[PDB]
């Protein structure tokens, strides 16, 4: 498959260059993985994600996605249009209120109720997570989103915002955990992009378009734009029959971009995810 005139984003996952704007994946598309958006909550009835999408759980008074932070990372997981694997089951997980926080205590919950609503689910070839999400550096988080992903479902966490190592923010600096950066598209790490040895891959982060609530669609930047991105991916991958979830962000670092990025600190990882799709 090949959708052209496609966000950047997805037109540089399936490239080793950047400035295309075609992206070219198996049609398969990640048909019978599932991914849990741990965010805001998606608007499930958004066209874009053609009934793929539901609100499972929400610790809230509601399920609808008052921010469209979440409706945008869902969007760009699985969105017809702007989301990487066209076909995978999407289920929100609201643990973020309307304006973007929440209290740890409700994340780690969240993270909690995936591994266990993993096992109410159908997803014969695998469970992602992506969380868009992060805070300060705590243990009680970081061990969550390894539970997690001992589990059998693929974390991918973002780095952060913050422009530093991401050591000292949860659930990024977790080890066990797939951390995203960001770049953006003339193949820089982002500005804004957190990084270090605890990173494992960069997603395209900067000038993201994507689904957002009230049926409309735009661009934002972050690294939490990157990890559905990778998320995506994944979900993308274990359909194709290419890796489990413990083992994807190892197969997904194994197969990306070497050496692409630039403004990358030392230290850091120089992988840009890749879905080494041969058309």
Known sequence: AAQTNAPWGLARISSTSPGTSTYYYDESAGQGSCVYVI??????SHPEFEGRAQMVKTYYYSSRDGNGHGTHCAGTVGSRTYGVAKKTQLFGVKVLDDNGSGQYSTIIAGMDFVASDKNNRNCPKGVV??????????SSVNSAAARLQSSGVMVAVAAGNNNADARNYSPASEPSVCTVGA?????RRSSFSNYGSVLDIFGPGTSILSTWIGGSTRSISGTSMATPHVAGLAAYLMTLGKTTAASACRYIADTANKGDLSNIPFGTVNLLAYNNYQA
């Open 39 to 44: 965010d805001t909550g998606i608007e499930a």
């Open 129 to 138: 997570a992506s969380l868009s999400l992060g805070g300060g550096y705590s």
């Open 183 to 187: 770049s953006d598209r003339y193949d």
